[PDB]
Design an enzyme around this catalytic site. Sequence first.
Site, short mmCIF file in Angstrom:
data_model
loop_
_atom_site.label_atom_id
_atom_site.label_comp_id
_atom_site.label_asym_id
_atom_site.label_seq_id
_atom_site.Cartn_x
_atom_site.Cartn_y
_atom_site.Cartn_z
CG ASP A 83 -2.33 -0.39 0.91
OD1 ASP A 83 -2.52 -1.24 -0.23
OD2 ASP A 83 -3.28 -0.25 1.33
CE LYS A 104 -3.07 4.89 -1.41
NZ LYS A 104 -4.19 4.43 -2.37
CG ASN A 113 -1.65 4.52 2.55
OD1 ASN A 113 -2.78 4.90 2.73
ND2 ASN A 113 -1.60 3.50 1.80
C1 LIG Z 1 -9.23 -1.46 -3.81
C2 LIG Z 1 -9.42 -1.54 -2.50
C3 LIG Z 1 -8.63 -2.87 -1.66
O1 LIG Z 1 -9.06 -3.02 -0.48
N1 LIG Z 1 -7.88 -3.42 -2.49
C4 LIG Z 1 -7.42 -4.36 -1.92
C5 LIG Z 1 -7.63 -5.62 -2.53
C6 LIG Z 1 -7.26 -7.08 -2.11
C7 LIG Z 1 -6.44 -6.90 -1.28
C8 LIG Z 1 -5.85 -5.82 -0.61
C9 LIG Z 1 -6.35 -4.73 -0.84
N2 LIG Z 1 -4.98 -5.94 0.35
C10 LIG Z 1 -4.24 -4.96 1.35
C11 LIG Z 1 -2.79 -4.86 0.74
C12 LIG Z 1 -2.37 -3.90 1.67
N3 LIG Z 1 -2.09 -4.26 3.16
C13 LIG Z 1 -1.60 -3.15 4.02
C14 LIG Z 1 -0.95 -3.62 4.99
C15 LIG Z 1 0.01 -4.40 4.99
C16 LIG Z 1 0.76 -4.77 6.17
C17 LIG Z 1 0.25 -4.39 7.58
C18 LIG Z 1 0.95 -4.87 8.65
N4 LIG Z 1 0.84 -6.10 8.82
C19 LIG Z 1 1.16 -6.76 10.12
C20 LIG Z 1 1.09 -7.90 10.19
C21 LIG Z 1 1.93 -8.75 11.29
N5 LIG Z 1 2.53 -7.74 12.10
C22 LIG Z 1 2.48 -6.37 11.92
O2 LIG Z 1 3.13 -5.71 12.94
C23 LIG Z 1 2.13 -5.84 11.01
C24 LIG Z 1 1.92 -4.53 10.73
C25 LIG Z 1 1.59 -3.90 9.50
C26 LIG Z 1 1.45 -2.47 9.38
C27 LIG Z 1 1.89 -1.84 8.24
C28 LIG Z 1 2.25 -0.52 8.11
C29 LIG Z 1 1.84 0.41 9.31
C30 LIG Z 1 1.48 -0.23 10.41
C31 LIG Z 1 1.18 -1.77 10.38
C32 LIG Z 1 -0.95 -3.40 7.48
C33 LIG Z 1 -1.45 -3.14 6.06
C34 LIG Z 1 -3.68 -4.36 3.45
C35 LIG Z 1 -4.45 -5.34 2.70
C36 LIG Z 1 -4.74 -7.25 0.48
O3 LIG Z 1 -4.07 -8.08 1.16
N6 LIG Z 1 -5.47 -7.92 -0.71
C37 LIG Z 1 -5.76 -9.21 -0.85
#
Ligand SMILES: *CCC(=O)Nc1ccc2c(c1)n(C1CCN(Cc3ccc(-c4nc5cc[nH]c(=O)c5cc4-c4ccccc4)cc3)CC1)c(=O)n2C
Length: 410
Positions: free
Chosen positions: A240, A242, A245
């Site tokens: 994500d 960009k 964010n």
């Molecule tokens: C068009 C809208 C949409 O939702 N599209 C979409 C389709 C299918 C998806 C999507 C999105 N996602 C998203 C991909 C981006 N991630 C963002 C994200 C990644 C990782 C973390 C995160 N994970 C952790 C896991 C374990 N321990 C941790 O400490 C973690 C910490 C973080 C984190 C990262 C940055 C800042 C704070 C914490 C968070 C968000 C979300 C899903 C997708 O997977 N699929 C299939």
Amino acid sequence: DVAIVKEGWLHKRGEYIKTWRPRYFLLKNDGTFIGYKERPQDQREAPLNNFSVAQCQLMKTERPRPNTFIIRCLQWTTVIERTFHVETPEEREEWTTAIQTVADGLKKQRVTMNEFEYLKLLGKGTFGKVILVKEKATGRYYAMKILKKEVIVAKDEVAHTLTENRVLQNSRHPFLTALKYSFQTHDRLCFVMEYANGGELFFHLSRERVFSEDRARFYGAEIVSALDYLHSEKNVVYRDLKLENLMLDKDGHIKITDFGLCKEGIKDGATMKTFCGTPEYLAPEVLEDNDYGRAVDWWGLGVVMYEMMCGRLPFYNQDHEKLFELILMEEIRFPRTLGPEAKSLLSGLLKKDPKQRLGGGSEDAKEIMQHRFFAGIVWQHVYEKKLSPPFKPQVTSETDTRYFDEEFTA
Ligand SMILES: *CCC(=O)Nc1ccc2c(c1)n(C1CCN(Cc3ccc(-c4nc5cc[nH]c(=O)c5cc4-c4ccccc4)cc3)CC1)c(=O)n2C
């Protein structure tokens, strides 16, 4: 002992361009479920949790298409879904049983809403919403993810353990938005994320139009540090990265946000094709629903750092079909006011082929940390926030509301 449980051709609906694409998927005993454009010839890299079917629920649906099955997973604080299709119901049953069998094999091993003041809706999603809140006691700013409990857990006891663990399991990296509180209601699951009050990075970049190479190096170094952490410690791709964010805290350090939710895309009517959000930041392999890995985030780094130093997005066009082609095919061009070190970094980060992309190798972030653009940068000092921020946001404390007042109209 990592082996393939089941493999074959599937029809996977695009995650951003929601159309059905033929993909060859591999189910492994470690929980990984990955699809390719063509069945690969070949492992040594550590598995990514993005493709894990561990602790997921399988659903069989006849909508929008017959013989559809969905893998729904809660990853950190976001409920994700991967939608598949096969030709025969018997074929769907074989896949679902296999996936469930693998998921079962891996199985073996007071905050309330009253304490918060509602401020503003941040975003809506399929399985809940995200709102900006303020803790009444302290006056701190938080982003609260409010998710439907049904789509996540079937028992209140297991959900309670999820709330307790998510807080303790919270990664403590200085440049990620930390999960502060986690609690549940009778029908909702809530994740309380810390909210930076130093202003959006799109706001700051818009006002000063362009960042210097030094200032972009600072922000870039902190992003690399965060991405290195997610990859090597959490084994997850951020996907994500960009400008929207990225935020600054009161001190001027980078905060990478976790405020997003999975949505159903917006139908345009252009051949009735549904698109999820805007594709300008999407990596080529992600845009094509191909196999992807850690290199995705480095593309994101390239996109962000390009705009900071050049003053515009690397690829932009009003038409989406043309915008796709620019991302997939067109070479990246640079302003003639951009230094050679910057050009080398950006061109490396924005390589079309992830296997050739800077940081795409087995060494990951280390390939970027050793790049000549980050020469002189002491990376231990970056993690420990020893580096003094080049820009100090105009706030007196963490409760200062300047970037929440009519000052950001400018
Ligand atoms: C068009 C809208 C949409 O939702 N599209 C979409 C389709 C299918 C998806 C999507 C999105 N996602 C998203 C991909 C981006 N991630 C963002 C994200 C990644 C990782 C973390 C995160 N994970 C952790 C896991 C374990 N321990 C941790 O400490 C973690 C910490 C973080 C984190 C990262 C940055 C800042 C704070 C914490 C968070 C968000 C979300 C899903 C997708 O997977 N699929 C299939």
